[PDB]
Amino acid sequence: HHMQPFAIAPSILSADFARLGEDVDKVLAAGADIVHFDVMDNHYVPNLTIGPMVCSALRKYGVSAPIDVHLMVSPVDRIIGDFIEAGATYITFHPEASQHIDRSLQLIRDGGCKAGLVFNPATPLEVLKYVMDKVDMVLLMSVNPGFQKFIPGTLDKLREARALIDASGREIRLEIDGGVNVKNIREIAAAGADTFVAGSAIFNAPDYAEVIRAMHAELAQAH
Amino acid sequence: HHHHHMQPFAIAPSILSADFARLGEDVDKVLAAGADIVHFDVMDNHYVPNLTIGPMVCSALRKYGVSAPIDVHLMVSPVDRIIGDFIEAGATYITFHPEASQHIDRSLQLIRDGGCKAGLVFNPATPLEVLKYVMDKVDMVLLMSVNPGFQKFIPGTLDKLREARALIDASGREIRLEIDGGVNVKNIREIAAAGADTFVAGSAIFNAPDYAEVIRAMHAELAQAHQ
Amino acid sequence: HMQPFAIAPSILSADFARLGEDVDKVLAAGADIVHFDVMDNHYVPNLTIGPMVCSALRKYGVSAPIDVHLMVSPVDRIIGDFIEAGATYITFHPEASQHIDRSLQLIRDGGCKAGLVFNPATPLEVLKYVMDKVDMVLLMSVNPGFQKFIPGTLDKLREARALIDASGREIRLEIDGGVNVKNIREIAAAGADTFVAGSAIFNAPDYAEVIRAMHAELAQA
């Protein structure tokens, strides 16, 4: 397996939006690697979350950690420009949400960001065949985004995705989001995931550091 | 002073210009500085070319302790589903654009049945004719003096403010007249004199070095607005 | 200057397992017009019945005028099918058509009578330049597709009656939403001459008594 170093990406949807900078500082001080950014436009999913200004506010506040913007929006091209200027690090989108996937991935790369494709539980991986050189991260949803129980079939899709990336020779992260907890993160990594989104499991816990410490402990006795 | 059927003046800062890294703190300062209403600009990247903040941020302000009335301006389309979320999130006012709903009456009724005050937002070009048959169901009328989601006060709004003020005055209903777009200390007197009683300002307050001084200066002009 | 009173029950409240039977009974009970509520799950959050049901009633023997209310968007394609299906009136919402005049003209060219439907909030302004092409004006007293009569509708009825009277043309003034025996008198006095009732008729045990009761209130005008 030509994987990448493990990374924990809390989704700030579970964070305190009245004290966002403080809450992000606390989870990063607790050892988190990536700030995960769930953007919903009330159309691709039945919910509306936060826009590029929140990414801007985090950068102006001092957050230099990588910000991983997951676009659950459609169409994607215009708002991609705003997240590039707002300081996003990763920009990922669903292939179903863009009429021209290649041009959309190229738009992110030409902005200096790392680009990715997000796969709904039912979405097959076939669309990756002709954009392998243009995706830096692959996100598999283990729940239906925007609507809370881990879909077990995702483990098979994680293993298929890990195989596809390994045979490409390119450095591509395998990200997972949806029902990720301490009790299953060991099994999830064994399927081939190297980038882990957790939300409630971290931000709603009484101690962020122990939970992250518990996750990394399980991740070591996983591979 | 005057004979209009108005409501007591209210200053409604737009938290679009606030510090989203310290939002609860920033809202506390503007409220402690004399602001009345927290104005909430909700944009869904479809009705306007921008995406701002959803109901979870309104919930976060309520869970933090913000008890001031929260004025949710919906620049989204369609509106009914997200209207429910802002009701459950603790919004006080919910206003939306007539163009954004296929069924304006049902949408207004949805807000009222939540216990909220309802309103219609008017783009610079949108005429006021649609108010004729919903006068009993609007608690506030928001006049946009700029194109929402895109930056200079459009002067013709003063004429529409006067037209809106006249419709409310002759209606017998208690309806707030709100204005948003380029409202600052140098023009708030003329805007109030045109008939607005609810004033949304954004950068003028949140980008100022002292929030209380600016708000006092606004009230200074509002006092000399009906000579 | 009005048009003769007409009672137009909406078959949304009828028995779709015995539809021909129920329509015969309500018509034999004195109903004038069969009102047809078409919803496309887009313009309103519900899906009801399409032109094949209008077609099925015509093949069954129903010769009464069938009044097709389109709560759909866009409208031009399905207008054609309802022309071929044997519709008598075809009405649609001005917001649902990008080209109101062409859509009204499309109905007239099929031989049907055309109308525009106005949501509770919709002002009557759009009638100014199409008065020659509407045979019926339908005012919604409830939000279509979603149930209590909106009182402000009576004010719009009187404004609508004034516009029709000043046109000199034969245009029906229709009302739909919460119309019952207890209010049909005031609704007619406001200027309505065409009355859609649904639950009030089809859920009653005897159709003839309700319609006879309604005309009694229409008599005290």
Next chain:
Amino acid sequence: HMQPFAIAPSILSADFARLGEDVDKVLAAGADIVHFDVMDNHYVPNLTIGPMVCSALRKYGVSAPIDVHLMVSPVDRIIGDFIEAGATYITFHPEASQHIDRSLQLIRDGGCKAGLVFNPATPLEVLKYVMDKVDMVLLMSVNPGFQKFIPGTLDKLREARALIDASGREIRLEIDGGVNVKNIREIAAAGADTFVAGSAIFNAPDYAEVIRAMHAELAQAH
């Protein structure tokens, strides 16, 4: 590893002026499932019948399984209504839902059986990660909503039956579009176990003879 043969007449060809009577006759003539073609004027250029008609069939006494084929987009809201309306199967096209799994999960959580419908050109790959959530697979042998059996459907039937056979799950393989007595044997031999016919049954003078003829050819299939 197929399922018991089932004949599912499509009531688009039935008499909607005497629908309860017409359905009783086809059911008394040996039909197994009432097939329900729902069109929203957007996903296909036609509008047929909504949940109230399914309700009317239940309120009239029809206890047979009602198989609702949703040719609509989006699907989630009307799915809820058909669950309450008393549907037995609810199927939809994968292209018509932005979130296929949540839509399938919606049907199952209502107590209904769920399925995916595939247009003549639509490939079967999308079933790979939803095999546990589909109870029926419907292949269209004509373009839905627009009348001759597309011959390539037999090959897709054989491919679909293999996928279901290799899954170990109880999933019906349904076919709809130009299915008649003269071709139902070959269709069944291709792997279908649920057969939608419309005009072939409801436009016939005796429903029982046509249905009887279909079962005769279904025997001389495999």
Next chain:
Amino acid sequence: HHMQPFAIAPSILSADFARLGEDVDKVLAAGADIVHFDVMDNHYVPNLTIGPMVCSALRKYGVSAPIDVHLMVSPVDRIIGDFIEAGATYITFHPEASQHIDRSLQLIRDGGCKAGLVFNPATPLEVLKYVMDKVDMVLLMSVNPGFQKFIPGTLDKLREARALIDASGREIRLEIDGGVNVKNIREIAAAGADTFVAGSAIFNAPDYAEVIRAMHAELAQAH
């Protein structure tokens, strides 16, 4: 009546697109004032006509006359930019086709172009009240656009339109389009129109100049 000098604006949909430059030269040399450009995007109307490249092609060829682009498209803002760079003189659009009429009108003005609003046969004139300072032309459709006989009520709307312009004090052209010929141009002008779009009446005539002279002859026996 604060009108503008009469202008004949033949619409090139009736022109020979195999010999467009030649045909435009002839109709202008025959006395036409404005080249009328009908843009349809197959969505706002059931037809697709010509885009900005044809406006560019006429300018690259030498056409210096004012080019009047009527946008029957929705949305309008993106293609407004392209018609500005392509060299349009007027850009007009339908208010129903823009979610933000004022911003769209301002976009045209900021490109250096003249702006306008187009009214379908049923569209009321009410929307002009708060954009009078931003419209240089008002186009009244006397037929349903994109689908051929003058709708008689348009004459009443012209008089209503002319009265609104007269009361504004602004230099605003009153344009008419749909079934305009020599036999009715006098009555149309007396109702208050000062800019006349004709298509087949001119381009299908054997001599373009004779028709234009006849139209200009009828315009004299107007007011």
Next chain:
Amino acid sequence: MQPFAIAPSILSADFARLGEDVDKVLAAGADIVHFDVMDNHYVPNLTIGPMVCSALRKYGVSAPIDVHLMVSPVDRIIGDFIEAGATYITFHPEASQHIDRSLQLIRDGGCKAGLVFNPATPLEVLKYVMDKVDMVLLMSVNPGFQKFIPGTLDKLREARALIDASGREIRLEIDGGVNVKNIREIAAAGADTFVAGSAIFNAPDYAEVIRAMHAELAQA
């Protein structure tokens, strides 16, 4: 394969003298007049509609006209291009809710039908419509937005294999950054129908460029 064919795209032609320019490119040896139709929705541009195809036929153009539809939805305008005299009509599968019916509409009109594949679009959708496609167009750039995407060669070879294994007569068309310096390799990948725009219509002499292209097509 099919005999090599050069299909200049009239997006690069002179729309003020279109009949003349099309006459010149055909007299210079071009085989097919390529027609790029954009509706400002499927792609961020609006080009030319059926009236222009009709105008070319009324002018005398009897050559095959290849209409590539970058529009969505497609069925209504397919009807218009049939009336206008189109020879090929191709569309993107993502732009039609019912691909088979749309291909069938073209075939029932007497035209040849095809499917266009965006750079990211896989070829999987061809499996059940192989009997209904006369041409397969591979986009080597993002349509409507100009440099040849290298992965297209891999898809060309994969597509050529699918057609070769089908036994059906289907043209393999390529569009996007096709020039004299790369047309040999593209044909070697399996393409037999070549769309060029600027390379031909912006050249000072159309005949020399087309002659130069055919020379490279020979050493394939």
